């Protein structure tokens, strides 16, 4: 099952699960510079794609 993975299906699966999704964030400690959720949600996609 490992040997059947190439780059094409890797970026297909990663565009399925990572690209333009809504993440769950958990911060603890001095997290004032941790960005607001709209910044992470904007970081989940590229405008160059």
């Amino acid at each position: 099952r490992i040997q059947e993975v190439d780059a094409q299906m890797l970026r297909d699966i990663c565009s399925k699960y990572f690209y333009d999704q809504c993440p769950a964030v958990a911060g603890y400690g001095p997290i004032e510079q941790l960005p607001d959720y709209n910044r992470i949600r904007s970081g989940m996609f590229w405008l160059r794609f």
């Binding site: 809504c22 001095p30 004032e32 510079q33 959720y37 709209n38 949600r41």
Partner: protein, 72 residues
């Protein structure tokens, strides 16, 4: 600049994704009473000077009109 503004301890914040929640959740049913409450809180400070200067404007216009008239 972010990260060195204040010292905050023991505060937890919960949010949602903007795609996970409604844009206008109970818009009219919770917006009409809240607008009415803000109006109830602010009319007695805002409105009566404007009512007084409305009466000043109307009185001044009618006094100008009466001073236009020829006195018999």
């Amino acid at each position: 600049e972010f990260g060195n503004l204040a010292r905050i301890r023991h505060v937890i914040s919960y949010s949602l994704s903007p795609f996970e929640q409604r844009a206008f959740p109970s818009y009219f049913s919770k917006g009409i009473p809240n607008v009415l409450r803000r109006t109830r809180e602010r009319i007695l400070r805002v409105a009566p000077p404007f009512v007084v200067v409305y009466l000043i404007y109307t009185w001044g216009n009618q006094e100008f009109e009466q001073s236009k008239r020829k006195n018999p």
